[PDB]
Design a protein around this nucleic acid. Structure first.
Ligand SMILES: Cc1cn([C@H]2C[C@H](O)[C@@H](COP(=O)(O)OP(=O)(O)OP(=O)(O)O)O2)c(=O)[nH]c1=O
Ligand SMILES: [Mg+2]
Ligand SMILES: [Mg+2]
Ligand SMILES: [Zn+2]
Lengths: 645, 217, 114
RNA sequence: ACCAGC
């Protein structure tokens, strides 16, 4: 087992130069350094470590280091170099699953961290936590160039090579080894009967928990689909931007003549301030003097202003009744502009040269093992039920990537699971009601007959209502879904509670398992804990933040892992079938939101093979962990991501 | 503008160059130093006469501006005072190139620099004709730009014939090739460069394909 | 750039205040933010006010971000625009009124932009 | 505090 690091010229997008590399060994204990002219010897040492049957340790290796090696081995000295995934291990993957809760333990330590590293899984943060850090590189470099005449306001301190970069690389691999000796010192994930510094690639994975393999495979898959990208249309979204930019310039000239300007107190200094529809304070003052009583006070001195109070509002002047709809439309168009093009993290400022968008996908960002998305966020664009929703999802299509050998568009297949957490709930409480609850779920659609038996107008309101009622609501927040008072909210809870009397029994069992005593305060709550963590489906310690949300962190944390194994198995079957992954192959992963997957492929027969093998992969997921239920998905075929939602 | 800035009154200090790759020994040998006046650290270059008398300063700031201390002479060369003889000189375009060549040769060859640049190089090479007579070979080292080609073409007219040889570089000039690690390819250009051929005259044998091309038109 | 959330002190909320890399905080609930002539005219001396133009239509924030401010000196109304440099300092000014009295104060360069 | 998602 070796521990190595890299230094490059820039990020993974455009990397063209190797600088230095330090390899430390657990068999000879040598700081084997390398040079810019010694990159071939570095690759020979890595291939000798691969061929002997060992493991190579990196930090953020799946996302950054391994494709940088693969690119620099080809574009500098023209030789193929591929690392197997069963030999490369990462320390940033292990930092997220053992220590999955840093924001709830960073206080009391902030005396150590400067403040900018608050809850950071970066290696400099752990160097500050392990108290092994002989200064920084960026700040010392900036201080050196401010000591010299030439200043460097850019902040990309990886152009030239020197010896200080070698010294901080040695410091970086020392910090990496210091993180690895602590992260391997856990007893719940690694059994304390064998040393993990001398085992092969068939022993380190097969003599530990299942959670350490699935997370590294998911990190490999998510780094690969991050490297793949997502096709995007530039002209169709500029047409939308030039469409809805001349709309808010009409909604301000027409509106300020209705709601006039006024003087505001700054001998008494006054100012001539005009109506700003973006502020929620001016609209409140203009609805006070228009003859309206809010009858709703969330704040201690101010009413609430949102979409549900601007619908049931009546004034005497009939012009303001039509103007409030224009105010709501202006706020919607303002949010559309802020999300689409004019935002700091907008769509048009993260488009690559090949017309694609590469988004950061964090595999373990939530406290319940749910993956998050950032820079940009591709899982929060408006749906088809929202206004200007179909015109946005038509641009995020897979038919905008012509093939490089034929010049033809491709076909997008989107596969969603229906009733995931509600079927997992039937899996958990099957030992209480003897398992006659998951049979009605398999008998037709559950949300349709729930809508019929609950007289909700839409299926979406019923799907919102059932997960509102299930995850610990109140008396008014689920009466707010139907718009009635607390009496209907009480009678619907008494209706849906007496149907299946196994939810309260499972809740009482979980409360008897976790908590033992709970002292009550009139303004707080003092809870003496007994077991803070919950064993998951793979022995992972799932953290609990609040005791009345234990059903939440027991349900959705067990629902993400089956999807995380299913997205692995649905390509492990296709690779063994004899297909090819990548843009020059047969299929390519594009987007993985919490429920559905979006794959893009060349011909429709490949989409048929994918939609056939997805059910078999989901069946293997349901069979591998011995589930009492029967899992099922549903797929759609189309040109873009407006039909396949 | 005022006077020659002394290092004592301006808090002079000899340091290295991290962003360009020059240690403090070369700037100690030459006299390119750093003043701390008005808060902002100013870079400043020193000019000397043949005997060693300080005659001119070149003041540059953090934001690429120029400041002359007074009467800038036409025979002002950066590095002329240190060497008074030799068989092979290298004339650099700027001032960091001469320090870069001093770094890669351990202070062996007589290497100087210009005082005007590529704009008024012909006047300062015509006014320094008597200094180049005591030498045996001259290696012109200019930028790989259109202005650099114009300077190496037109400034090589007032020079003595038979002693001018021009080297080529893959970078902009020698300093980025020092930064990109091309320290072996520059020494061959110092030792074996190309003579003063491409002025505009052609050979009788080099046209053999091109006359064919006009024969195929 | 945004980093994370801190509990506010004015509104007293838990996730209302946000911390930035520049050192300033901003709360979303309480809305509190923390941290010729040859003479360039001073802003506070000539009664500088960021008034929004009414007859043609320009918001106040554009006049704040551009530096086009109204002076009320000598009982009249002037519209002073400011020309700056790359360093972030006022280089020159332009004065415009109803009679279009072009009184360009300061060192007006030949390559001045806005 | 608001908006969107699953
Ligand atoms: C809308 C919503 C869904 N969820 C859960 C329910 C699901 O397990 C997952 C995604 O929900 P959905 O995909 O919207 O619902 P579904 O998969 O049960 O049905 P279908 O595919 O036929 O439309 O997230 C919440 O926890 N809170 C929510 O507000
Ligand atoms: Mg690294
Ligand atoms: Mg679904
Ligand atoms: Zn606040």
């Amino acid at each position: 087992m070796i521990v190595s690091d890299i230094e490059a010229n820039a990020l993974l997008e455009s990397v063209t130069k190797f600088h230095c590399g330090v390899i430390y060994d657990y068999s000879t204990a040598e700081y084997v350094s390398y040079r810019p002219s010694d990159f071939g010897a570095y690759l020979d040492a890595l291939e000798a470590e691969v061929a002997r049957g060992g493991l190579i340790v990196f930090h953020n290796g799946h996302k950054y280091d391994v494709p940088a090696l693969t690119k620099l081995a080809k574009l500098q000295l023209n030789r193929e170099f591929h690392l197997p995934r069963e030999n490369c291990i990462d320390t940033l993957v292990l930092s997220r699953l053992i220590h999955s809760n840093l924001k709830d333990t960073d206080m009391g330590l902030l005396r150590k961290l400067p403040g900018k590293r608050f809850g950071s899984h970066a290696l400099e943060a752990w160097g500050y936590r392990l108290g092994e850090m002989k200064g920084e590189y960026k700040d010392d470099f900036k201080r050196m160039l401010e000591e010299q005449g030439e200043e460097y306001v850019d902040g990309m301190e990886w152009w030239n090579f020197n010896e200080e970069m070698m010294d901080y690389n040695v410091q970086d691999v020392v910090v990496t080894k210091a993180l690895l000796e602590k992260l391997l010192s856990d007893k719940h994930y690694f059994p304390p009967e064998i040393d993990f510094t001398d085992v092969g690639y068939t022993t380190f994975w097969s003599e530990s928990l299942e959670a350490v393999d699935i997370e590294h495979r998911a990190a490999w898959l998510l780094a690969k689909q991050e490297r793949n990208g997502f096709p995007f249309d530039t002209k169709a979204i500029e047409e939308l931007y030039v469409e809805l930019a001349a709309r808010r310039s009409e909604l301000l000239r027409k509106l300020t003549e209705t709601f006039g300007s006024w003087y505001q107190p700054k001998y008494t200094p006054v100012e001539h301030v005009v109506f700003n529809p973006s502020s929620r304070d001016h609209i409140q003052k203009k609805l006070q003097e228009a003859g309206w009583v809010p009858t709703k006070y969330t704040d201690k001195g101010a009413p609430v202003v949102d979409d549900e109070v601007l619908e049931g509002v009546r004034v005497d002047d009939p012009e303001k009744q039509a103007a409030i709809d224009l105010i709501k439309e202006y706020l919607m168009i303002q949010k559309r502009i802020g999300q689409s093009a004019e935002g700091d993290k907008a769509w048009l400022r993260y488009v690559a040269e090949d017309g694609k968008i590469h988004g950061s996908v964090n595999p373990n960002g939530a406290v319940t093992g749910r993956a998050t998305h950032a820079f940009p966020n591709l899982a929060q664009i408006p749906g088809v039920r929202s206004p200007y929703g179909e015109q946005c999802r038509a641009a995020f299509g897979a038919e905008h990537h012509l093939d490089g050998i034929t010049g033809k568009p491709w076909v997008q297949a989107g596969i969603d699971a229906s009733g995931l957490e509600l079927r997992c709930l039937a899996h958990f409480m099957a030992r209480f009601d003897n398992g006659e609850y998951a049979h009605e779920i398999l008998n037709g659609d559950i949300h349709t007959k729930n809508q019929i038996a609950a007289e909700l107008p839409t299926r979406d309101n019923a799907k919102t209502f059932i997960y509102g009622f299930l995850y610990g609501a109140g008396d008014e927040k689920i009466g707010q879904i139907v718009g009635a008072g607390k009496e209907r909210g009480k009678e619907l809870k008494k209706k849906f509670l007496e149907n299946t009397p196994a939810i309260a029994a499972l809740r009482e069992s979980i409360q008897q398992t976790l908590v033992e005593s709970s002292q009550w305060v009139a303004g707080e709550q003092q809870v003496k804990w007994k077991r803070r963590w919950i064993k998951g489906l793979d022995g992972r310690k799932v953290h609990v933040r609040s005791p009345h949300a234990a059903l939440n962190t027991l349900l959705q944390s067990a629902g993400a892992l089956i999807c995380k194994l299913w997205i692995i198995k649905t390509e492990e079957m296709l690779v063994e079938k004899g297909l090819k992954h990548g843009w020059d192959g047969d299929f390519a992963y594009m987007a993985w939101v919490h429920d559905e997957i979006q794959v893009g492929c060349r011909t429709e027969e490949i989409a048929q093979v994918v939609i056939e093998t997805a059910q078999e992969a989901m069946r293997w997921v349901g069979d591998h962990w011995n589930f009492r239920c029967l899992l099922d998905t549903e797929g759609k075929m189309g040109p873009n991501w407006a039909i396949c939602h | 503008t005022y006077n020659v800035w002394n290092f004592g009154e301006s808090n002079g200090r000899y340091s290295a160059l991290t962003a360009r790759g020059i240690s403090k020994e070369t700037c100690q040998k030459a006299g390119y130093w750093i003043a701390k006046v008005d808060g902002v650290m100013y870079q400043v270059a020193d000019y000397r006469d043949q005997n060693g008398n300080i005659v001119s300063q070149k003041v540059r700031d953090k934001d690429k501006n120029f400041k002359t201390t007074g009467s800038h002479k036409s025979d002002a060369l950066f590095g002329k005072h240190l060497w008074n003889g030799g068989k092979k000189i290298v004339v650099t375009e700027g001032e960091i190139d001469m320090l870069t060549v001093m770094e890669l040769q351990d202070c062996k060859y007589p290497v100087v620099s210009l005082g005007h640049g590529a704009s008024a190089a012909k006047k300062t090479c015509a006014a320094n004709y008597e200094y180049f007579d005591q030498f045996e070979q001259i290696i012109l080292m200019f930028d790989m730009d259109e202005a650099g080609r114009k300077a190496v073409e037109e400034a090589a007219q007032v020079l003595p014939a038979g002693k001018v040889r021009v080297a080529v570089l893959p970078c902009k000039d020698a300093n980025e090739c020092h930064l990109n690690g091309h320290d072996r390819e520059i020494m061959e250009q110092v030792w074996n460069a190309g003579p003063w051929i491409p002025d505009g005259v052609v050979s009788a044998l080099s046209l053999r394909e091109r006359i064919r091309e006009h024969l195929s038109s | 750039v945004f980093l994370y959330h801190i509990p506010c002190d004015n509104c007293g909320s838990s996730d209302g205040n946000s911390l930035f890399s520049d050192g300033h905080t901003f709360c979303y609930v309480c809305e509190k933010w923390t941290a010729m002539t040859y003479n360039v005219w001073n802003f506070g001396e000539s009664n500088g006010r960021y008034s929004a133009l009414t007859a043609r239509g320009i918001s106040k924030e554009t006049c704040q971000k551009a530096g086009y401010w109204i002076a009320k000196v000598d009982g009249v109304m002037y519209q002073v625009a400011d020309y700056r440099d790359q360093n972030g300092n006022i280089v020159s000014q332009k004065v415009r009124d109803k009679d279009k009295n072009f009184k360009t104060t300061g060192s007006h360069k030949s390559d001045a932009l806005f």
